[PDB]
Write a protein that binds this DNA or RNA. Sequence first.
RNA 1: ACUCUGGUUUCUCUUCAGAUCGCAUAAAUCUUUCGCCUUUUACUAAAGAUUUCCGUGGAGAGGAACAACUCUGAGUCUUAACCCAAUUUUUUGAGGCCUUGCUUUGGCAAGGCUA
Lengths: 74, 77, 836, 111, 111, 86
Amino acid sequence: KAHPPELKKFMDKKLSLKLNGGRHVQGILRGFDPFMNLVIDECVEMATSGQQNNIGMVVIRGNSIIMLEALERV
Amino acid sequence: IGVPIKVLHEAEGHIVTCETNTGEVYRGKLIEAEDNMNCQMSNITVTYRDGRVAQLEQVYIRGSKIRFLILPDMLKN
Amino acid sequence: MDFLADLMDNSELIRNVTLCGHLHHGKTCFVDCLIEQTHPEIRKRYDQDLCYTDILFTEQERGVGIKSTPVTVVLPDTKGKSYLFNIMDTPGHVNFSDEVTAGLRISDGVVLFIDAAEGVMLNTERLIKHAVQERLAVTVCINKIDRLILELKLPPTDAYYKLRHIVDEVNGLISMYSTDENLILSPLLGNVCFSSSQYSICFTLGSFAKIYADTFGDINYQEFAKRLWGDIYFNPKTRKFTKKAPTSSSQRSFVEFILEPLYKILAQVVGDVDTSLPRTLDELGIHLTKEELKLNIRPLLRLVCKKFFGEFTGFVDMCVQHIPSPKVGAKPKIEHTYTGGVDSDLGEAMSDCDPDGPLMCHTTKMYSTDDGVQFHAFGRVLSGTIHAGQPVKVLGENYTLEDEEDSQICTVGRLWISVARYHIEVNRVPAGNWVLIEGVDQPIVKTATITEPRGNEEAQIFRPLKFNTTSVIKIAVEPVNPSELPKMLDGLRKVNKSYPSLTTKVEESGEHVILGTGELYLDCVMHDLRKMYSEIDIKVADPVVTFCETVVETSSLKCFAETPNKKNKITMIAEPLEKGLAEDIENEVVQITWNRKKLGEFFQTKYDWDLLAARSIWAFGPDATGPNILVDDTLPSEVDKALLGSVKDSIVQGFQWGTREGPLCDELIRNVKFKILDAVVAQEPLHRGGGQIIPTARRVVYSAFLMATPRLMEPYYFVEVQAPADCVSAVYTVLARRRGHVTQDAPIPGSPLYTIKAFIPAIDSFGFETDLRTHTQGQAFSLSVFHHWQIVPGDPLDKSIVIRPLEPQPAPHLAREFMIKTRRRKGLSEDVSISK
Amino acid sequence: TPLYTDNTANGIALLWAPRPFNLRSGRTRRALDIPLVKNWYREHCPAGQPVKVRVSYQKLLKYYVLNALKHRPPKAQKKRYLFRSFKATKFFQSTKLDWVEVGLQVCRQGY
Amino acid sequence: TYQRWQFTLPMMSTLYRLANQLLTDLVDDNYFYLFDLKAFFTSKALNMAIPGGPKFEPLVRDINLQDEDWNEFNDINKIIIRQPIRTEYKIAFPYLYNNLPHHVHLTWYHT
Amino acid sequence: GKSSKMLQHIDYRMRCILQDGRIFIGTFKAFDKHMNLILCDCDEFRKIKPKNSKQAEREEKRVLGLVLLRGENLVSMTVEGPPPKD
RNA sequence: ACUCUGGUUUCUCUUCAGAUCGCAUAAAUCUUUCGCCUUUUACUAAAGAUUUCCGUGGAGAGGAACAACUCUGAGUCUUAACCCAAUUUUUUGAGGCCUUGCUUUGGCAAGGCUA
């Protein structure tokens, strides 16, 4: 019980994640947690109009995160 | 050890589709299947609810935002 | 059961694996346990094991497996779904290991087996080295774990130390054989599975961790396996894997939590029925019925171990972790087995393992039908899908793009790909799966590649099959009466197809000679020939060893032969090869296809040969593997360099012919550095008759060998005779009688037994094992495999005293009488003529 | 639970016993068909013996192997217990007596 | 009825202790290398008898295999005998070291 | 305590209404503790459930086959018919 | 934890033998060869085929004796002190609007605004 997600292959790789409310973020994964809460270093959130705003290193929770896709080779 | 989770873990490596709660349907080869239905695939095709389709080299969708999944007919026998 | 065919479609769920064993009993016991787990109908009897891998009745009666059985099924996994395992169980004999060589091309992964009590063996070491040279994954299995637990009754800590020593020895052997970084093997790494194969007791560290998780708690099995595998120690106060070993009297994690429960269960079961009380069973979470308790000690222990230890999920997990799917593993196999290179478009497609691409299936195994009239060619389908009735061109092992007549078209009937039930319900088989093609047996002898008729016009067959062992024991075959001679010959052909190692040669003396590796091998050959392939009674001769001809001194005078066309004469001198070059060349270290600069650098660095000598035209016997090498040392000052280039092919053909047929006994010649001194020939193409060179070349070879000092060479067989300590000295006495020399002798670590490595000459090797076993009153056991050619004493052509017809000759006289007897038996002129 | 108990050695020794003792529990055999000497001549040789001992061992091994060769019962009998029928016959009766008394009775009957 | 017996492990231990005198210490069948019933069967099926094995009367006259005439390959002038081909060699591998083996039996190789 | 209600309707073709509003008719052969069902030969329709439809009984129906529906998106299920022989 | 589950000793009787009937081993007759040989009782010694003979198992039947003690599987098959949900349901932030296209209306699919 309490198994962690297989995020070791995507650690330190630039990927794009989809957050709740129709949000899109893109950045390098700085780590993972047992509840899927990860750290995105140098994350840039893309707005619905098309502009992207860089928020730096932040923490993305897996409760509102829909799915992540790596932008590089796994 | 569930029967549906065991059938989802046994269906890894074949072509299957998964429709999420947001309407995005991703079809491809299930590379890794977790115990909580977290599916990591590679070279999948994702079609959104608006009709736009795209191809992803590698993705990993959690089971919390996943609605249903359709596997091949080889697992029925 | 349709899921068995459904899973074959998924190219990523197949696990092509071949087994190896110290003795065929251990591997076949594991295969039978796997079959019983997969098939609930077949249950092993209490008196004897089912041994489903021993299809032949000869293996069933003798007790040693004869032919490899490629039979397995879909098997489940603890953390994964069922994968369609297909395992080719191999015989556990030194000579019969040649058959396992075929399995080397059947699959790309060898799940090696090592007995816990016996430890490392000569057969196991040879198989590991051959697999390492074959570029395949190796996953070790500690077999007969109950032997240490029950037979030896060793302390648990001592048993763990012995197992660790065995694993370390295996790892050292693997590292010596191959330098790849993947050579690390350990229960933590997942390359070691502890499978006794008796009582159905198989597991790994992950299997034990999963059992612990199922029993109580929710501990992550992967982490627990990574921690408890080694000697990292467990701290109860800290309650964690503590590498510092804090507790004074604690035992290692593997000993404390893995070996100790097994020892306790075995002690409770074997010790007493009250020892394995219902209270103890409930503490173990098992409730056996009264009938199961009323059984004998062995069936009760088997049932308890089988019920307690699941259904061999640990082995499946270990195989899935390391043995790759055919899609992943086809590329290294394409690089190694294929002689056409992976860069080919068809080769590149095969490397991707595309079922919808071209059809490229390599069949190397041969299996007789129940009636024995027809055969079936068993082989992997690297690319494409074979369909029943679809015609295919079966290019043989000797097929080449030079001549298309070497291949023939044939139809493929029922496939019978599934072998666990030995049924023929299979219609079509996808790429990467083993197929038992029927109907194409006639055009092909062994190790031939079938392909689609018209889809590809340039695909060629894979490289010819190679064996580590060398057939050195030759035996003549004659019918009781010639009236039905062809019938026996028919069976002889059935022998050639069935056994790849056996070599049937029609000698010029009208005798059919069968070449095999071991005495038991040829005995099984003759049993199969008489009982199955040819019911005619067959008379034989005394076993003989193929002999070699070598040189010790340089040629005294040059030898020249003149071509009939206007007297074009080539002169040469032969010299003995440099010491240590024979085994180096024979080990495929350097090939004639190598670049001239690379070969020159190799010879200048290793053997310090002259660069000009290296730049000379090099032959190196047949197929660039013959120890007898040929260097064209002709002086560039002479104008024959253009003529030599125009006659290089003829010279090479003459040299290879002379290597195949020497001057004495016309046998193979090795370690001869034939130096082509010079050649004077008219530049006119008319005078350059193709048929005037090769006979002249072989005459020059014979004269040079006569000019140099000739010696006979016998194949010294390596024998790893294991024996109890008391008989060890007596064992040497046996080698004393059979002209044997003891190379080494060491006690078996953790076992009272004692291994002795000896080098027995093949002439006296016939029946050596029988003498050793009978003299030691059935205690000592031996196993002999050919090791190396050693020069026989005496001179083949020196005028010596003729030996008595029924009396052993003195040591100095062995060479001459060997030579005369071999020449007369071959049918050639007995007397050796210096003029000839 | 004790890893090593007093009964472990006994059981592990019995696990490699000869045929009669390897079985925890089975069915009985008659008194006359339990050959004790059987395992003796089946050995390689009583080493350090006179020639006559060898000859006796070889001859008895010949007898044993000839007995082993021809061994196939066609006897699909109807289990007609003739002795039991004779016991049930009114011309005979049943009683209990010492073996020596039965022996002297048989001697008198034979006389 | 006294037909089947169900006992305990310590009773086997003590009975084996008592019967050690009448029971040999051999535990592995490899000790009966060439003395198992199959070795004697294939010895009887031939003229040759192993030194430890009894002699036998041949099943048939077998004049065909008694003294065969010299042939092109059967000639002793070409056969080389480093060591005598004893009866052990023939019994061990009846299908190799025996011209016309015919009706023989198969022996267990190793344990 | 008994739990015989889930095993009695197993292996039969049931029509379950999900939380999104779709009706999936399929052979419910496997269930779970989280309410995740497995429908073999499943067909999902979002137009209407065809029960004696005069104009049309199948509208917006897509047959997927072996489908795995999660219990978080499932609301209720009703019995439609028994399973076949195969 | 609940309901049914139901004997083993025995004595005989009648069948069938698979199963090394038996983890032992005899004998008789006939048949072919071997030593034969002097007529049968006989032999020698092996093969071949029967038969009797010691025994046994399976299966069935009928009485006695423990027949009332059940063995046992099956029959979903029986519970609270104090602590709990960021992925599978007794805590879940999934809430509102307009326009566009279709349908006869009802309803269906997409976008943004939002706090």
